[PDB]
Design an enzyme around this catalytic site. Structure first.
Site, PDB file in Angstrom:
ATOM      1  N   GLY F  15      -5.018 -42.408   7.560  1.00  0.00           N
ATOM      2  CA  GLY F  15      -6.334 -42.190   6.992  1.00  0.00           C
ATOM      3  C   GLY F  15      -7.416 -43.078   7.570  1.00  0.00           C
ATOM      4  O   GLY F  15      -8.564 -43.041   7.118  1.00  0.00           O
ATOM      5  N   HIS F  16      -7.065 -43.881   8.573  1.00  0.00           N
ATOM      6  CA  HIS F  16      -8.067 -44.526   9.411  1.00  0.00           C
ATOM      7  C   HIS F  16      -8.727 -43.509  10.346  1.00  0.00           C
ATOM      8  O   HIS F  16      -8.485 -42.298  10.284  1.00  0.00           O
ATOM      9  CB  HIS F  16      -7.446 -45.645  10.244  1.00  0.00           C
ATOM     10  CG  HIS F  16      -8.438 -46.574  10.863  1.00  0.00           C
ATOM     11  ND1 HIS F  16      -9.212 -46.219  11.946  1.00  0.00           N
ATOM     12  CD2 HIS F  16      -8.764 -47.855  10.570  1.00  0.00           C
ATOM     13  CE1 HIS F  16      -9.981 -47.237  12.288  1.00  0.00           C
ATOM     14  NE2 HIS F  16      -9.728 -48.242  11.470  1.00  0.00           N
ATOM     15  N   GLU F  17      -9.578 -44.021  11.231  1.00  0.00           N
ATOM     16  CA  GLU F  17     -10.174 -43.191  12.267  1.00  0.00           C
ATOM     17  C   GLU F  17      -9.107 -42.723  13.253  1.00  0.00           C
ATOM     18  O   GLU F  17      -8.112 -43.414  13.497  1.00  0.00           O
ATOM     19  CB  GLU F  17     -11.286 -43.952  12.996  1.00  0.00           C
ATOM     20  CG  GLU F  17     -12.483 -44.348  12.135  1.00  0.00           C
ATOM     21  CD  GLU F  17     -13.414 -43.187  11.848  1.00  0.00           C
ATOM     22  OE1 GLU F  17     -13.010 -42.269  11.102  1.00  0.00           O
ATOM     23  OE2 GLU F  17     -14.550 -43.190  12.366  1.00  0.00           O
ATOM     24  N   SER F  18      -9.310 -41.505  13.773  1.00  0.00           N
ATOM     25  CA  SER F  18      -8.390 -40.810  14.687  1.00  0.00           C
ATOM     26  C   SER F  18      -6.991 -40.637  14.093  1.00  0.00           C
ATOM     27  O   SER F  18      -5.994 -40.629  14.819  1.00  0.00           O
ATOM     28  CB  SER F  18      -8.312 -41.505  16.053  1.00  0.00           C
ATOM     29  OG  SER F  18      -7.604 -40.709  16.988  1.00  0.00           O
ATOM     30  N   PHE F  19      -6.905 -40.497  12.770  1.00  0.00           N
ATOM     31  CA  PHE F  19      -5.630 -40.276  12.098  1.00  0.00           C
ATOM     32  C   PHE F  19      -5.676 -39.209  11.018  1.00  0.00           C
ATOM     33  O   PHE F  19      -4.613 -38.840  10.507  1.00  0.00           O
ATOM     34  CB  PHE F  19      -5.116 -41.582  11.472  1.00  0.00           C
ATOM     35  CG  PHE F  19      -4.338 -42.447  12.419  1.00  0.00           C
ATOM     36  CD1 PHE F  19      -3.081 -42.056  12.858  1.00  0.00           C
ATOM     37  CD2 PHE F  19      -4.854 -43.656  12.861  1.00  0.00           C
ATOM     38  CE1 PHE F  19      -2.355 -42.852  13.727  1.00  0.00           C
ATOM     39  CE2 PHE F  19      -4.133 -44.457  13.731  1.00  0.00           C
ATOM     40  CZ  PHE F  19      -2.883 -44.053  14.165  1.00  0.00           C
TER      41      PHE F  19
END
Lengths: 185, 49, 144, 57, 141, 48, 102
Positions: F15-19
């Site tokens: 749920g971070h960026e690029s995920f």
RNA sequence: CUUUAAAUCCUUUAACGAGGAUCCAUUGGAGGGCAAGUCUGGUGCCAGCAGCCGCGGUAAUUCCAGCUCCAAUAGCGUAUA
């Protein structure tokens, strides 16, 4: 460190010239006349004759009246007589260099059964040997490349379990009977 | 006799496939009412939550 | 891409068609000071200049672009700038009014390697009008 | 022509045909004995170059 | 021999040593320079990476163009030229593929009308090229 | 009813960026989703 | 000599012009795209026709490499200006009866 | 049934189990070395074959596919020392 053997040797030999007319001619002639499968067994018969010829040349290299010369001269001559390929009256050491491939192939089990008159053709004899029908002194042999000794020549007959020598009829005979009483009733 | 096709290589596994989906079907017709499996929960959210 | 620009700055020449203003001439020879207005394309440092109507004789290599004695590197279309053009070493210097006059439409000298260099990576700075200028300078320089 | 250096040209544009009836075998007991008796009994040695078993001419 | 004496043997042995060392195949087989300069490094087969496809011209009496592949080796790291064996096989391979390469059969020399090429392609993408030619196997996707 | 269950299965998720687009192997199998929300911010584009 | 069939381009051909002559049986030609290509002489064209400089040549394109290509057939003067009148060559192509000034 | 720590492997033995006995034998070659077609059809110094000589130019005893034939045979061909 295991309890193994690792002892094995080659039985046949590959000739130097791969393609030639005449060598192929009598090799195919021997295969066709003696009912052989392929050229491997005639090459191994050639190799056994080459071994016996090399032993005879080495033994005739040694001088006369040496105990080793007399010892395996008598041993080799007795073995060749006991096979039955050599005649009894030719009891000499230098007669080893005067026999050929068909003399060794004459003592094959296949052609012995074919000459005994209980088989029709040589290939029929090979099939009948291959398919467990002939015993050699109360011992069945299913392989054609069996060297019949001179003492065991007069004791070749059909197996007691074979239908030809007296026994139960075969699988297609009882199937034919089952079809006969199936169609009749 | 003409039961299968000319080559048995593509006809031999048909009985095996018939037995594996009839085993799949029978396992779907004798089923229990209680004491089922463990469900799955699935945690999601924003960063620094 | 910064290093690619730094070592491909000399080999990359942007297309430029330039319209000359009359009587705004200061130095006729060694160097060439002529206050000339951009009508198509853009002007950068090291861009050669030629004449199409006089069997494609090069004028020289430019040195700086000055807009009211202020050095501006890139000049767009519709601005009156002053360009200092220097003669190339190894060839004879040129004079105004004899080798070329104020009745000619000036174009920038470009090469097929420069067109390929602008084609491969310079998609950002090369627009539709610059593509039409590339087509026109292909159609006037006898290059395919 | 298309081009000079396009691979699989004669492999690509050749025609396609099928196979024929199945042959038998006797493991060389008469498979090579047939050409033996063809070369021996049937074909006589003609004084010339040669006379092969596959000579369809 | 010529020097024929009963109580001399090391002269004959040293002369035979020098005359055997002054040869071609023995000097190739018993020096490290020939094994160092060999692209295979003394191996029958080797793996490499396809990076270019080119076409070389044949010799003077035989007029054709041959399809050959530039391959960079895995064990050493230097480029060779390898020749695809059979007709209609350049389209079976593409760039950036692993490939198995082997010699022609002249112990490291050019065979036929193809100059500068001494190796041939056997296996590509862990599947045999002969099965790709004869249709026994379908090429990986 | 809490006695008969054979434990519980827990899935954690990025749920971070690029995920946020790798939920094919994470969300297509889990039954009960739990959404942890921070009341300092609230809505987020990846959460909606 | 006889007026043969005038062939157009198919998939893999391009109309090029020779600008410099190479040795060792090889040739250099300038294709009408803007890039450089190296050409090789056909085996059927080994000694039957002598390709000179500054003439229209038909070159067969190669797809896996665009630096090496092969010529096909030569257009000398009359099919050259007739196909120039057809409009495949642009205005920028000069023949001008083999002028070396350009 | 036997073997075996216990089985499996072999042998023995019931009941099954073959007619195009589909219960289907491939691997390389057919100009010379070097066994083996001046066969048929196709592209026609192209595609390619070829360890070496050399075959390919719109009559190919060598390429690409069918028929026949020879070589060894559950084995055969290639590269390396």
């Amino acid at each position: 460190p295991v309890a193994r053997s690792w002892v094995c040797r080659k039985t046949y030999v590959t000739p130097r010239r791969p393609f030639e007319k005449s060598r192929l001619d009598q090799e195919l002639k021997l295969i066709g006349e003696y009912g052989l499968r392929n050229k491997r067994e005639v090459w191994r018969v050639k190799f056994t004759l080459a071994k016996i010829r090399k032993a005879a040349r080495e033994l005739l290299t040694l001088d006369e009246k040496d105990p080793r010369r007399l010892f395996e001269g008598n041993a080799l001559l007795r073995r060749l007589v006991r096979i039955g390929v050599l005649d009894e009256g030719k009891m000499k050491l230098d007669y080893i260099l005067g026999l050929k491939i068909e003399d060794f192939l004459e003592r094959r089990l296949q052609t012995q059964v074919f000459k005994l008159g209980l088989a029709k053709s040589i290939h029929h004899a090979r099939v009948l040997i291959r398919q467990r029908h002939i015993r050699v002194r109360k011992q069945v042999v299913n392989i054609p490349s069996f060297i019949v000794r001179l003492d065991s020549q007069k004791h070749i007959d059909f197996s007691l379990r074979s239908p030809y020598g007296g026994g139960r009829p075969g699988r297609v005979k009882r199937k034919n009977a089952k079809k006969g009483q199936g169609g009749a009733g | 006799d003409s039961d299968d096709d000319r080559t048995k290589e593509e006809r031999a596994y048909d009985k095996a496939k018939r037995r594996i989906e009839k085993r799949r079907l029978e396992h779907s017709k004798n089923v229990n009412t209680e004491k089922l499996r463990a469900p799955v929960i699935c945690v999601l959210g924003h960063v620094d939550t | 891409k910064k290093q690619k620009q730094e070592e491909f700055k000399h080999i990359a020449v942007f297309p430029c068609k330039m319209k000359i203003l009359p009587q705004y001439i200061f130095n006729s020879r060694d160097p060439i000071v002529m206050g000339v207005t951009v009508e198509a394309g853009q002007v950068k440092q090291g861009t050669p200049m030629c004449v199409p109507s006089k069997n494609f004789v090069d004028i020289g290599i430019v040195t700086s672009i000055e807009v009211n004695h202020k050095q501006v590197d890139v000049a767009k279309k519709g601005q009156e700038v002053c360009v200092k053009i220097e003669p190339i070493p190894g060839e004879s210097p040129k004079m105004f009014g004899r080798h070329f006059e104020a009745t000619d439409i000036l174009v920038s000298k470009i090469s097929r390697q420069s067109i390929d260099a602008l084609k491969d990576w310079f998609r950002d700075e090369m627009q539709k009008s610059d593509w039409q200028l590339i087509v026109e300078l292909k159609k006037v320089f006898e290059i395919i | 022509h298309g081009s000079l250096a396009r691979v699989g040209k004669v492999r690509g544009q050749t025609l396609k045909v099928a196979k024929q009836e199945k042959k038998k075998k006797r493991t060389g007991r008469a498979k090579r004995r047939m050409q033996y008796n063809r070369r021996f009994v049937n074909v006589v040695p003609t004084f010339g170059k040669k006379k092969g078993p596959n000579a369809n001419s | 021999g010529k020097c024929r004496g009963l109580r001399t043997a090391r002269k004959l042995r040293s002369h035979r040593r020098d005359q055997k060392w002054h040869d071609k195949q023995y000097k190739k087989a018993h020096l490290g320079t020939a094994l160092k300069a060999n692209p295979f490094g003394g191996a029958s087969h080797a793996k490499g990476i396809v990076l270019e496809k080119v076409g070389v011209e044949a010799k003077q009496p035989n007029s054709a163009i041959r399809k050959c592949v530039r391959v960079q080796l895995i064990k050493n790291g230097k480029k060779i030229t390898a020749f695809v064996p059979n007709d209609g096989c350049l389209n079976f391979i593409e760039e950036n593929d692993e490939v198995l390469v082997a010699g022609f059969g002249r112990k490291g020399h050019a065979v036929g009308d193809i100059p500068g090429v001494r190796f041939k392609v056997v296996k590509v993408a862990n599947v045999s090229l002969l099965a790709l030619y004869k249709g026994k196997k379908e090429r990986p996707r | 009813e809490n006695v008969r269950i054979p434990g519980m299965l827990i899935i954690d998720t990025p749920g971070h960026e690029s995920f946020s687009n790798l939920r094919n192997r994470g969300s297509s199998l889990c039954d009960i989703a739990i959404l942890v929300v921070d009341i300092m911010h609230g809505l987020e584009p990846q959460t909606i | 000599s006889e007026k043969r069939e005038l062939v157009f381009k198919e998939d893999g051909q391009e109309y090029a012009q020779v600008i410099k002559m190479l040795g060792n049986g090889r040739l250099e030609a300038m294709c009408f795209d803007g890039v450089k290509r190296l050409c090789h002489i056909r085996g059927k064209l080994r000694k039957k026709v002598w390709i000179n400089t500054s003439d229209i040549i038909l070159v067969g394109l190669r797809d896996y490499q665009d630096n090496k290509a092969d010529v096909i057939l030569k257009y000398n003067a009359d099919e050259a200006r007739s196909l120039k009148a057809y409009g495949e060559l642009p205005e920028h192509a000069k023949i001008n009866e083999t002028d070396t000034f350009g």
